[PDB]
């Protein structure tokens, strides 16, 4: 990859390979790293997005309505599925999530990492 | 075994500037997820450097936590692992040290913007 990577951007990213219940393959991800890191760091922190389910069932899941964000399907952000990617894995930028949606992402992220102290 | 937030585990991280190799990691996932989920979220620990030069890094003294070298926790190098990768538990970080980790996590993930 990108030229201005910003927090909340939804990128097509290469996650291959993984093992176990980890989410891999070329799939959409959301940038959750702060924008200073997104500019200077060689890597970005992302949360995985899946289309296998489209409804959020646990507090660390956030839904994306395709009638709003231009995806194949209604999708779910998996804030329990976080990984740091070299910026070369970011293929295409699909869109970005609104401030109101990133509010939900931030909440699920705080629950996911136990930042309730 | 139980997996608790703050535990320092030896985990097989290969394959992966992403950190790779059978390396020490610290559990940063909440304890409810550490019990019920098949996966845990961890932050990388490196022995290449010994000082935290940015606030997203947290140092840990080898004279305090039964460690190889004076290491640095990299709270911008975080990944979700299947629990089968966790090999041996070495120790755990105190509530004082995890508070620094929490703060570094707040910076790293940009949860500090208002």
């Amino acid at each position, epitope marked *: 990859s990108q030229d201005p990577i910003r927090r909340g951007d939804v990128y097509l990213a290469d996650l291959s390979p993984v093992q176990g219940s980890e989410q891999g393959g070329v799939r959409p991800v959301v940038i959750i790293q702060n924008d*200073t890191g997104n*500019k*200077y*760091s*060689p890597t970005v922190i992302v949360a995985a997005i899946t289309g296998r389910i489209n409804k959020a069932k646990i507090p660390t899941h956030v839904e994306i309505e395709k009638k709003k964000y231009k995806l194949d399907k209604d999708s779910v952000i998996l804030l329990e599925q976080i990984r740091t990617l070299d910026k070369k894995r970011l293929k295409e930028k699909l869109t970005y999530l609104s401030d109101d949606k990133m509010k939900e992402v931030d909440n699920a992220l705080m629950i996911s990492l136990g930042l309730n102290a | 075994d139980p997996i608790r937030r703050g535990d320092v585990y030896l985990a097989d991280l290969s394959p992966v*500037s992403e950190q790779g190799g059978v390396r020490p990691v610290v559990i940063i996932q909440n304890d409810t997820g550490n019990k019920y989920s098949p996966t845990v979220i961890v932050a990388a620990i*490196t022995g290449r*450097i010994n000082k935290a030069k*940015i606030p997203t890094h947290v140092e840990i003294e080898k004279k305090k936590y039964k460690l190889d070298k004076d290491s640095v926790i990299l709270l911008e190098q975080i990944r979700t692992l299947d629990k089968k990768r966790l090999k041996e538990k070495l120790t755990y970080l105190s509530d004082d040290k995890m508070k620094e980790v929490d703060n570094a996590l707040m910076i790293s993930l940009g949860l500090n913007a208002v």
Partner: nanobody
Amino acid sequence: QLQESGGGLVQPGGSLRLSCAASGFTLDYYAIGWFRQAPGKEREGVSCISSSDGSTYYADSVKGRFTISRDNAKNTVYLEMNSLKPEDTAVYYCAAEAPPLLYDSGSYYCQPLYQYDYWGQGTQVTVSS
């Protein structure tokens, strides 16, 4: 340790060359950064290179105008500044980070908060008309 010079007063469109010399250690094994501090604004990483002469970062505000280069024979690093603009007015600092290095990435060491091992004393650059 880290001695720097080359600043001064220039008119818009002029050029300068900053120098950064080290005494007691070899700069070729270090990550080198050039930072500028303008009044009231955050420290800005303008040009940085890792210990390998093949991973250079330039700030977008200086891309095409500034050039960093290491002289391993003089143990010195330079910042060549061309087409200077009034918005380049600031105190310029060079900084060196000793190895081992965590990342071979110039941009990583140009982030505003990175605490380099060694810093220059700073030199004023002023561009006005």
